[PDB]
Amino acid sequence: EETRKIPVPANRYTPLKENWMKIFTPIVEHLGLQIRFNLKSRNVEIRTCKETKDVSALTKAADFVKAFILGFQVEDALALIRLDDLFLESFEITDVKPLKGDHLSRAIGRIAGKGGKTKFTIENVTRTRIVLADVKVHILGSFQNIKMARTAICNLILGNPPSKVYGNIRAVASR
Amino acid sequence: VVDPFSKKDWYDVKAPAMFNIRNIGKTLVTRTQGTKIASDGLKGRVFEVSLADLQNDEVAFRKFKLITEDVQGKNCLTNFHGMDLTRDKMCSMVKKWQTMIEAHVDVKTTDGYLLRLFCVGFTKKRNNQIRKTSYAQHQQVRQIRKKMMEIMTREVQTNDLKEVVNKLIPDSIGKDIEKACQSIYPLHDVFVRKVKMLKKPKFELGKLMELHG
Amino acid sequence: PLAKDLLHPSPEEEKRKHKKKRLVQSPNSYFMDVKCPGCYKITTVFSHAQTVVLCVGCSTVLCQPTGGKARLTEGCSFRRKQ
Amino acid sequence: EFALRLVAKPGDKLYCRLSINTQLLARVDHLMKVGKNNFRPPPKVESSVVRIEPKNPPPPINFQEWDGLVRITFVRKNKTLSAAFKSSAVQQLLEKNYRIHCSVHNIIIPEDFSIADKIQQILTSTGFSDKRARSMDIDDFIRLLHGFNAEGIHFS
Amino acid sequence: AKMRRAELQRARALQSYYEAKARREKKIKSKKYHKVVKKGKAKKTLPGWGEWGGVGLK
Amino acid sequence: LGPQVAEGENVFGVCHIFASFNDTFVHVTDLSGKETICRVTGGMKVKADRDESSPYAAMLAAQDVAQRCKELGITALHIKLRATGGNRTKTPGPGAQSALRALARSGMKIGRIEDVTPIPSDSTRRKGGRRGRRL
RNA sequence: CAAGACGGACCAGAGCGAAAGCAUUUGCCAAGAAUGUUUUCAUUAAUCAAGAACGAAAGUCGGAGGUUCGAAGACGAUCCGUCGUAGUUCCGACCAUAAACGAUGCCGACCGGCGAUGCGGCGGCGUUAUUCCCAUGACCCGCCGGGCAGCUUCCGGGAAACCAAAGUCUUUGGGUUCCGGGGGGAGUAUGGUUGCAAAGCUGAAACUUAAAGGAAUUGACGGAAGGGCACCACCAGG
């Protein structure tokens, strides 16, 4: 038997309650794995059974629920199950420049943009999914798309305006 | 130009008698070629073994460091070296709207093993509480820390290694602290999060024998 | 709204206000008389007393000073005075 | 910028290593201020013309030695030569060169020797201890190099 | 009773997030930000939890 | 050759998957961690500095390490993930995930997953300046 | 094993400080606001020219230490990379400047609502300290005081953004300090003065110009992006 434990934070319990159906139904139907949610230790527990094939699905299944722990939407992690080369890379905003106080919140606002649209635009440029924590940034996609999204984000918080990075990333996506 | 792994051999590393699952695995040593012996390369090796592989029903977030220091013909003999919590559990325990209290004592046990104890505790929101945060004041924090230090001083210094380890297996000391600090500020997750081994006494073989059987 | 007699406030409002901000200021403290459990003597103690008060004959601590009102020893009896 | 740093007199804010070195090895004249409409594309800063000719024969100064000493003194130009020579890298290079000199001439180094103390007392013996590098002319550097070379301290 | 108690606790948490955002926005004195936000305002039984829920065993 | 272990019972090693921001190291060792069995980088696997940190190179490295461990008869692995740590970024990159799913694809038993990366209490000044980001 | 550095997560809608600033435990030392008060003194106060204390970072003069980072510099590419000097760390002297910000003197009065938060105090059922054997801590309800910060508002005000002060202002007077007088010349010349130095404080005129500047609402606009349809468009074909 193979054991995977995925931790859940305190703020992720309610979206896990509201999205549990679309979490166990993809696993229990076509991945052939047993899943439960240990409330006593607060862990999503995944183990194999007698009806599992292609054991790497287990690994992807863990990454599946890991994405929903990190804040990603459900169907993106469904695409993580369906596709074969999808990865997530995370870094804090202060991991590339020392920002304090109101500067850090301004960096958060520059990543998100007004209405979220700037972040949304970068997604539609790079075919990736970007989730902002309080200070951490998580990018889900393939390797080169992760690199383009990470370069766009690192330019956005360097001080470059969202319009300039917007135009540059919308032009450089034709390669 | 020639593989050293054929030249290697396998030894069996085993837990003390305080633990239910005793066979903790295998180790790969080279045979003695007359220059260096296998024992000298084997008498100092540290193993990071989780508690859930030592007891069938115990927790998984607790890890024990076991130092092997003897060989008995393909049977490594180990002893307590340290304790720690898994970093996933430590990251999960530090929630936001509360107070973190840490205490550490340098305590000498009954037979000379100088231990260092680190414990952590968190204030608990009451069942009827409407305030979002539960922040302990500074003097309350100092009182909780003082009681932590005195409880470990009165709890470890009077016992030997077998009793200390048998108390650390279910963390009875943390439960004692959580029960005792209830009249200062209610605490939430009290664990002895880290045990070090600063000073070991002179090497004895018999005490290892009652630690093993 | 905009229509009330400031000259005649009710007891609940004038009680509720700060002791300086009433119509005419008045203290919130009082003098109270205390019987020691081990004796019969009367001691007149300020409610907000800052000194520890000993019995003149028994030398038993009647009250301990706190930030506001004094903390009587358990066993002591007290009555509001005047 | 380069043309005015090239012809800089001591006391000017544009005095640099280029100024003192080019005033040592050669004679320079700033000739005529050139507008940039004469170029295509017109450059960033204005343009200028410099007439230069080397002194033939050159003054009998080792240019590697001169440039090394000036490189030490212009690490911080507004800082005094005493504090310029308190630097540990300066002590390292002068230790290397003084060890070379003692190896060549068979001079026995005492155990309690301090190279920095030696440099400090020679610099006070010269009178450049309280002077700063931004206000020194060619002749002061010539005297300093003469004293340091007479004391067996070389920069190479 | 207890449901209103949980509602009040949720209300305290939501007011905390709202007042944090309010102070953060009130620090911002740039006229472009205020103009853009003015334009924007004028424009407008479960398997799992209990035990091992799987095909092989329940 | 290999441990004298019955078929039902498995033998355990621990695999450090060090996902540096330029390549990935696959270092299999015993439970003690002192002596080694297999470790191949992106360096021996791809002859291009472009793909030194690619998921493909770490994948092929993990397949080579897995077949080496099977030839040694190591039937299981504990995983100790690691990023650069210290002053730098604290999260393992895509290379570590690629190596992990690759050695899961090879039928190797996976034991305890654990993130063991050098988190400081606090440390010295970072490599970048007051100004310099990644790009 | 050692050396120097730094105290993350907890860490905020927090708190403290005159400001600059302040986050490991423990002990010692001397301060401090608010609260409480039927204590004492009895006008002892407010505001600043002169003169003095403190003042981030960088900088200068002596030492100590030099882990990381790193002006300069040497190299390799063509805003980057490798190495790394002065420095960054500590002690003792200087320098006294910042977007040192609320781009917003200080003291005093009056003038809407709300429910949150930090400290102190007061009143009150209840739940907890494995029903705690009385108090005490933690929660809960309400009130009072000094705070930090919000939302709301035909109080009024403003050129407007907006302000519970930027209000109580042509219906123009509570007290007092510093300071501006169209744009440049120009923080320049000159003199004085402080500083080891870098520089700091004070600071013009001749002349020249018709502007300089603040706030907000806006049609069209080659285009640009998201979609949809079509074998008079495409893929595979005949």
Characterize the bridge pairing of strands B76-85 and B62-71.
antiparallel
3-state helix, strand, coil in chain E (%, to 5): 65, 0, 30
Nearest one of B208, B196, B210 to B77, comparing CA atoms: B208
Nucleotide lying nearest to B122, CA to C1' measure: G10
Structure letter (DSSP) for residue F49? S
Q: CB-based contacts of A142: which residues, under 8 Å, 6+ apart?
A: A85, A86, A87
Residue C82, amino acid: Q
- Residue ranges with strand state E in F30-120: 36-40, 76-82, 109-115
A154: chain F residues, CB-CB within 8 Å? 133-135
Residue A54, amino acid: D
What is the nearest CA distance from E13 to chain B, expressed in angstroms? 6
Spatial separation of the C-alpha atoms in residues D153 and D115, rounded to whole Å = 10
* Inter-CA distances, A44 with A12, A72, B67, C70, D128, Å: 12, 16, 33, 56, 76
Distance from the Cα of residue C71 to its chain's centroid: 11
Q: If you count them, how many residues does chain A have?
A: 175
Q: State the DSSP H helix or E strand holding residue D12, giving kind and residue range, or none if neither.
A: none
- Residue A148 backbone phi and psi in degrees, to 5: -65, -40
Domain limits, chain F: 1-135
Nearest one of A2, A70, A69, A68 to A31, comparing CA atoms: A2
Dihedral (CA of A135, A140, A145, A146) sign: positive
Dihedral, CA of residue B177, residue B182, residue B188 and residue B192, to nearest 10 = -10
* SS3 at position F7: coil
- Rg for chain C, CA atoms, rounded: 18
Whether residue A46 contacts residue A61, with contact meaning beta carbons closer than 8 Å, is answered with: yes
Resolution, rounded to a tenth of an Å? 3.2
So what CATH class is F1-135? alpha beta
Nearest one of B77, B61, B62 to B22, comparing CA atoms: B77
Whether residue F48 contacts residue F112, with contact meaning beta carbons closer than 8 Å, is answered with: no
Nucleotides of strand G within 7 Å of the protein's CB atoms:
4-13, 24-27, 35-38, 59-63, 65-72, 80-81, 84-88, 102-104, 115-123, 126-130, 132, 134-141, 143-145, 149-151, 161-163, 196-199, 215-217, 225-226
Q: Which residue has its C-alpha nearest to nucleotide G226's C1'?
A: A124
**Per-position DSSP letters for B70-129, written without gaps between them:** EESSS-EEEEEEEEEE-HHHHHHH--SSB-EEEEEEEEE-TTS-EEEEEEEEEB---TT-
* SS3 at position A124: helix
Q: Residue D7 has which token pair?
A: 């012809």
Q: Residue F98 has which token pair?
A: 């690629």
Furthest-apart CA atoms within chain F: distance in Å = 60
- Residue ranges with strand state E in A39-155: 43-47, 87-92, 129-132, 136-141
Q: Residue F101 has which token pair?
A: 């799913």
Distance from the Cα of residue B66 to its chain's centroid: 9
* Mutual angle of helices A117-126 and A143-158, in 10-degree steps: 150
User: B95: nearest CA in chain A?
Assistant: A10
Whether residue F45 contacts residue F110, with contact meaning beta carbons closer than 8 Å, is answered with: no
Long-range CB pairs of A100-108 (<8 Å, 24+ gap) are A102/E27, A104/A135, A105/E24, A107/A157, A108/A132, A108/A135
Spatial separation of the C-alpha atoms in residues B139 and B145, rounded to whole Å = 10
* Mutual angle of helices A74-82 and A56-70, in 10-degree steps: 160
Measured from the Cβ of residue C27, the count of other Cβ atoms closer than 10 Å reads 9
Side by side, the strands of the sheet bearing F24-29 are F36-40, F24-29, F12-19, F76-82, F109-115
**Structural domain boundaries enclosing C17:** 1-82
Which stretches within A71-101 are classed as H helix?
Answer: 74-82
Spatial separation of the C-alpha atoms in residues A131 and A137, rounded to whole Å = 6
Nearest one of B145, C74, A141 to F97, comparing CA atoms: A141
Dihedral, CA of residue B133, residue B134, residue B137 and residue B140, to nearest 10 = -170
Was C63 annotated as part of a binding site? no
Residue C21, amino acid: K
Q: If you count them, how many residues does chain C have?
A: 82
Characterize the bridge pairing of strands F12-19 and F24-29.
antiparallel
User: Is some CB atom of chain B closer than 8 A to the CB atom of A10?
Assistant: yes
Q: State the DSSP H helix or E strand holding residue D26, giving kind and residue range, or none if neither.
A: strand D26-34
Is E48 in contact with A114 (Cβ distance < 8 A)? no
Dihedral, CA of residue D145, residue D148, residue D153 and residue D155, to nearest 10 = -20
Whether residue C43 contacts residue C55, with contact meaning beta carbons closer than 8 Å, is answered with: yes
Q: Which residues pair with A35 in a beta bridge?
A: A46, E53
Distance from the Cα of residue C74 to its chain's centroid: 17
Q: CB-based contacts of D43: which residues, under 8 Å, 6+ apart?
A: D36
Residue F118: cis peptide before it, omega within 30 degrees of 0: no
Give the N- to C-terminal CA distance of chain F in Å, as an integer: 51
All partners of chain D with 3 or more CB pairs under 8 angstroms: none
